[PDB]
Design a protein around this ligand. Sequence first.
Ligand SMILES: O=C1C[C@@H](c2ccccc2)Oc2cc(O)cc(O)c21
Ligand SMILES: O=C1C[C@@H](c2ccccc2)Oc2cc(O)cc(O)c21
Ligand SMILES: [Cl-]
Ligand SMILES: [Cl-]
Lengths: 215, 215
Amino acid sequence: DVKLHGSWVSPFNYRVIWALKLKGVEFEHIVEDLTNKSELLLKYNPVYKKIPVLVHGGKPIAESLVILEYIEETWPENPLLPTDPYERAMARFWIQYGATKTAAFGALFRASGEELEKAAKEVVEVLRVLEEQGLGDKKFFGGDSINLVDISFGLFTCWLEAIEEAAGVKVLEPSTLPRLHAWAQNFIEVPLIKENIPDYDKLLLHMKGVREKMM
Amino acid sequence: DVKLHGSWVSPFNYRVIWALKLKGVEFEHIVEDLTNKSELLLKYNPVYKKIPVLVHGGKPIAESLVILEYIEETWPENPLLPTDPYERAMARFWIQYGATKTAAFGALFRASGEELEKAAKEVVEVLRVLEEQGLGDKKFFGGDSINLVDISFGLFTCWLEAIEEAAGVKVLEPSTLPRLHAWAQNFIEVPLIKENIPDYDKLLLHMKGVREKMM
Ligand SMILES: O=C1C[C@@H](c2ccccc2)Oc2cc(O)cc(O)c21
Ligand SMILES: O=C1C[C@@H](c2ccccc2)Oc2cc(O)cc(O)c21
Ligand SMILES: [Cl-]
Ligand SMILES: [Cl-]
């Protein structure tokens, strides 16, 4: 009834895995080979031809942020967004902030030496705004438990750690981002997240390969 | 009770004007001078320092797409989104498609001659996907009346017309995009839209100035 056209490494696909597991939704995970995309993937997502694609009752939903809101509306129990409209707008605002800034992380796999340091410092500043104005003193972006905002920022945990190791630069450190670093540790320790993340060695190998083609 | 920090030309600000007027919400329009931003604008939107910013009960909401969903949730009567989750996901998908592609329209004010023709043809292709897969045979993206998707694409009416005149290229034409061109005419003729759009001569003068600094 629910199928997820995914990947073993995509952070965008893992957002969907987390939301489905938080709702207790049974699903079939179909891992796509991106060098030879299936006929179902091209039919279900003709506009972008990308994963993830959620298929529910044979009907496709593409784009991880659109999928997450669909899951929240379709399975409303175990809510992943607040009820108050102003609080929901703040959650959507921070999710969109992450979506707009995820591009500035590309410079980490494009720049070198005394240019890569500047790219890392710019990314620390992006994360500091999120820490100060978004997270604040809460344990999670969702308060006492994870919500769609935590899920949307999960890529700043093991995926960012792998990018840091592949590029040879430091970004999310406790000295510079104390609350965000504590959040990243708490997020990765949530049993649902810990049991549903790529193997770090495999993820690091994937990130090293991505950095190689981006130079 | 409701204030809108706006502009006389921003299409993003006009999205918010339309949604407020469709809900019958009374508001004060505060036109900001972007060369000397008010202390209230910098306090209400510290992350982007941009308009529009909706202020409701003294609490600010920035980013036109976030504001639109806040208005829809706060004033649920006269709905601007469908009730079915799959239909709501399709609406959010097309809104995000427009938000991702609005950047490719910048090339219209950057390129010249036999390069500007290629940029215009690329934009026609972006609009054709929206026409075929999004609009289809419906009068509006919202069916028989305008919804958040029509509002999000309203910039493809008089703002795109002004960009076409300023740049000297044609994009949205009836021969090439029959259904989307009929939609743009029907949208601009909706009394709520017709009574709430910038004066074309002033908008064209603004677009010519924007093209001059972008070259
Ligand atoms: O576009 C991105 C974003 C990037 C990232 C991860 C963590 C922090 C910042 C940026 O990770 C990726 C990995 C992929 O397998 C495919 C992607 O398309 C991306
Ligand atoms: O970013 C944009 C988008 C652009 C547009 C309009 C119509 C069709 C495509 C693109 O119009 C604008 C006008 C502004 O006063 C300020 C802006 O920041 C924009
Ligand atoms: Cl995605
Ligand atoms: Cl905006």
